[PDB]
Amino acid sequence: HGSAFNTLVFSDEFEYEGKPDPEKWHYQVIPPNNGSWHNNELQHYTNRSENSFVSDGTLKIRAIKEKYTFEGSTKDYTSARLNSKFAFTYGKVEVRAKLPSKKGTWPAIWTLGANSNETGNYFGEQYGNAEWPACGSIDILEQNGWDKESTIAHFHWSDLNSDEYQNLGGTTPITNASGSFHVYSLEWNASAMKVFLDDTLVYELKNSQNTPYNAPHYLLLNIAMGGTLGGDIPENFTDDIFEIDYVRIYQ
């Protein structure tokens, strides 16, 4: 599957030490919603070494129970939310990773249309100003906080010719998501978007010109805490890691 996408256009093998490469990765830190993130999430996102770092051939994003204030808004958790400094239309995205094991964590590998104009993102209004869900988004991987034995792939968009919000996708079983690397991938072209866990198709959505999936998207990597899909966080939560061996994008 996906062999047609064979020209490497972007990658990070994470073989260096220190901050995620600033030529490749942009941090979001400004909350988009009056001092909070969306989905009733409980974290702030920071660009500190507490919450992301590269060492030993892998990127780690680390969520921590920690009081933290940004511009008058205090939250009880910190994490990181990275965006690629690379926007693309169509391709094969491969991310090899180990997921957080702890309850309450909501990791994600996903995309937004580069016309999102999301607050504090890297692209602003360069491509347009299509507020989510009109910019489109593809989940390559999410896990909720209460079931670490399944993964989620899910699309969110509004049709170009309607305000009608669409949200659909699938799930698949996973074994040892936290202790064993798996490859989470997307194959995206003018015909279809296919999300895989290793070689299992999680979901395929037919593409068309009436979707926002024919213009550039950028990649996001994050751990949210709590909220819709994070759920209740144990009182004893300390910290947890989302470990990414590499990101590769082919066209």
Ligand X SMILES: OC[C@H]1O[C@@H](O[C@H]2[C@H](O)[C@@H](O)[C@H](O[C@@H]3[C@@H](O)[C@@H](O)O[C@H](CO)[C@H]3O)O[C@@H]2CO)[C@H](O)[C@@H](O)[C@@H]1O
Residue 159: closest CA among 130, 188, 180: 130
245 binds, among ligand X, Ca ion, none (CB under 5 to 8 A by kind): Ca ion
Distance (Å, whole) CA 127 – CA 124 = 8
Asked if 228 contacts 39 with a C-beta cutoff of 8 angstroms, the reply is yes
Torsion of Cα atoms, 99 then 105 then 111 then 116, to 10°: -160
Q: Which is nearer to ligand X, 39 or 178 (CB)?
A: 39
Written as one letter, the residue type at 223 is I
Residue 13 labelled as part of a binding site? yes
Distance (Å, whole) CA 250 – CA 93 = 7
3-state SS assignment for residue 130: coil
Q: Could you tell me the smallest distance in angstroms from the CB atom of residue 118 to ligand X?
A: 5
Q: Could you tell me the smallest distance in angstroms from the CB atom of residue 32 to ligand X?
A: 6
147 binds, among ligand X, Ca ion, none (CB under 5 to 8 A by kind): none
Residues 141-200 that bind ligand X (CB under 6 A): 142, 156
The 93-112 site mask, x for binding ligand X (CB under 6 A), equals -------------x-x-x--
Q: Tell me which residue has tokens 């690629």.
A: 84
What are the structure tokens assigned to 145, written together?
């906080």
Residue 15 labelled as part of a binding site? yes
Residue 142 labelled as part of a binding site? no
Asked if 135 contacts 113 with a C-beta cutoff of 8 angstroms, the reply is yes
Q: Which is nearer to Ca ion, 188 or 246 (CB)?
A: 246
Contact window for Ca ion (CB under 5 A) among 50-58, 64-72, 101-109, 136-144:
50-58
Question: How is residue 164 annotated by DSSP?
Answer: -
Q: Judged by CB under 6 A, which of 132, 157, 184, 242 binds ligand X?
A: 132
- What is the DSSP pairing of strand 217-225 with strand 52-55? unpaired
Q: Which is nearer to ligand X, 242 or 246 (CB)?
A: 242
240 binds, among Ca ion, ligand X, none (CB under 5 to 8 A by kind): none
What are the structure tokens assigned to 65, written together?
């129970």
Please give the residue ranges that form the binding site for ligand X (CB under 6 A): 32, 38-39, 106, 108, 110, 118, 131-132, 137, 139, 142, 156
Q: Show binding-site residues for Ca(2+).
A: 13, 15, 57, 245
Please give the residue ranges that form the binding site for Ca ion (CB under 5 A): 13-14, 57, 245-246
